[PDB]
Each structure stands twice: as C-alpha cells, then as structure tokens.
C-alpha cells in the first residue's frame with residue numbers, strides 16, 4: 563500500500579514517526595483546494611476532491627528503505643489500477659516530507675527530478691515503445707508501469723504562481739491520460755476548460771499562465787517544462803530536462 567483515500571488518511575500525526583507529518587500536509591491541501599474565495603483555479607481538482615476521487619500517498623525522506631521510492635513505486639502501481647476503473651477524473655497527490663523550512667524553488671525542483679529518477683529503478687514494466695526514452699526528444703514524457711503520466715510539482719516556494727503552492731511540502735500530482743477524455747485541447751469542450759481554468763488563475767495568481775501551456779491546437783512538445791514551472795515567465799531551453 564501507502565495508497566489512501568481521504569477517509570484513510572490518519573486523523574492526527576506524531577511528527578517524529580514515519581508519515582507523522584502527513585495529516586497536516588493533507589489538511590492544508592484540502593483547505594487550499596476547497597477554498598471558496600477566491601476559488602482554487604482548477605475546478606476539476608476541487609470537484610475531484612468533493613466527489614472523493616483524489617487518492618494520496620507520501621514519501622518520508624527520513625525512512626527511505628520503508629517509506630521511500632520503492633514503496634511509492636508500489637503505491638503508483640496500485641493507483642494506476644484504481645485510476646483506470648470507476649470515475650475518469652481521479653488524481654494522485656503525493657506529499658514528500660518532512661517539510662524543509664527555507665527550501666527554495668530550485669531545491670524543490672531538484673528533489674522532484676531525483677524522485678522521478680529513483681522511481682524508474684522500481685518500475686516492473688519496460689519503457690513504452692511508443693514514447694521516446696531520450697529526455698531531449700520533443701515527445702518525451704515520464705512513463706511508469708507501461709504508460710505516460712501527467713505530472714507536476716507543487717511547492718510552498720511558489721510566491722506569484724500561488725496555484726502551485728499546495729502546502730508546506732513538495733507535492734507531486736499524478737494523473738493518467740484517462741482524465742482528459744472529452745477535453746482534448748483541440749475540442750470545443752477542451753477550449754472551454756482552458757478558458758474557465760485561466761479565468762480562475764487570473765484571480766488567484768499574481769503572474770499569468772506560463773507560455774509553455776499549450777493553446778491545444780498541436781501536441782505540446784517538451785512537456786517536461788510544464789512539470790516544474792518557474793515562478794516567473796522564463797522559458798527553459800527545450801534540451802535542458804534534468805532527468
């Protein structure tokens with residue numbers, strides 16, 4: 563395991579034990595995404611939360627042999643199975659802790675890429691034949707358990723891009739392709755989804771949508787850039803993926 567529904571996340575926690583800080587990270591996350599004024603910009607995530615469609619896990623950096631990447635690989639395999647049954651719009655939120663006071667965005671980003679690397683070692687499935695393995699390829703995406711994931715990193719060090727601050731921990735948000743059924747970027751519903759989320763971003767964030775966010779007319783190349791947005795509108799070089 564370590565794959566939890568909301569009800570299964572423990573009620574309170576003892577900071578010194580493995581995952582003893584998770585109750586607090588979970589409360590702050592749920593407070594952020596359910597906040598009513600201004601609303602959390604992604605109404606899909608809010609609704610996911612309200613319907614009980616979000617799952618959770620964690621990594622405890624102090625207990626790597628038992629509550630680390632290997633256990634997360636097992637939890638992701640279980641999540642992948644859950645995500646292809648029942649409702650289409652599910653998300654997995656993974657808290658990485660304990661929180662490190664003072665951490666900068668660069669540091670959180672470094673930790674994010676290290677974890678993705680480490681998870682690779684615990685994959686039981688080969689890299690998908692239809693996604694290139696070179697991360698400098700325009701079509702590269704992170705893959706695990708035989709398919710590509712949609713993934714991004716949230717951090718308290720986001721000051722203007724407040725939408726990506728989900729509480730005190732480095733937080734990973736994972737989804738399978740299924741969540742986008744009917745809302746592909748090129749469709750009328752997909753465009754409506756973009757308009758609606760971006761209106762929410764305008765009122766919640768102090769900086770506008772990042773330039774690497776697609777208009778949805780073409781497949782977006784160098785998706786890696788979207789996993790770890792900067793807090794400004796700088797655009798990284800397509801070929802500088804850190805994995």
Ligand code: HEM
Pocket residue numbers: 595604606607608610616651652653655714725726735741742745755756757759760775776788791
């Ligand atoms: C807890 C779950 C979720 C969170 C925390 C979340 C968070 C976000 C954030 C922060 C953005 C703004 C763009 C960015 O920073 O990358 C975003 C945009 C978006 N999200 Fe979510 N989201 C969640 C679940 C979902 C689900 C389940 C779907 C679809 C069913 C979805 C669809 C979208 C779409 C379509 C956009 C807009 C992309 C654009 O304007 O180009 N999200 N989400």
